Amino acid sequence: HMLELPHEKDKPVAEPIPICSFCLGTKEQNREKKPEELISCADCGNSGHPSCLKFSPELTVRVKALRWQCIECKTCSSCRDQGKNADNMLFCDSCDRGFHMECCDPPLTRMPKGMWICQICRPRKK
């Protein structure tokens, strides 16, 4: 199961908008005109087909279990702010949470070459 942060629990969940913000299709019609359940932003309600969000099935299953924010709403899970540079907020490849590079421990200055996952998704050591 996906672990939730205390501040994510019992935060309000916005009314979901039942069409995709990318293609304007409902859950009945993604871009291939096939049914596909939407993922919806807990802050603004904006939704997306996982295919339109470019999420894998594995990531989709994970983000559906969490209080997810859309691309525009995403705030840093550490400092809780947005900041002014979008190329400074990494999105976790395991849970899609955002973290500013400077809010990582230790801070990052340079982009990872491959996947990046947050400290929440890294398992505890033996």
Partner: peptide, 12 residues
Amino acid sequence: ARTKQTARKSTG
């Protein structure tokens, strides 16, 4: 890795 910027470009 992905950022808010890259996600915007990828999905926009």
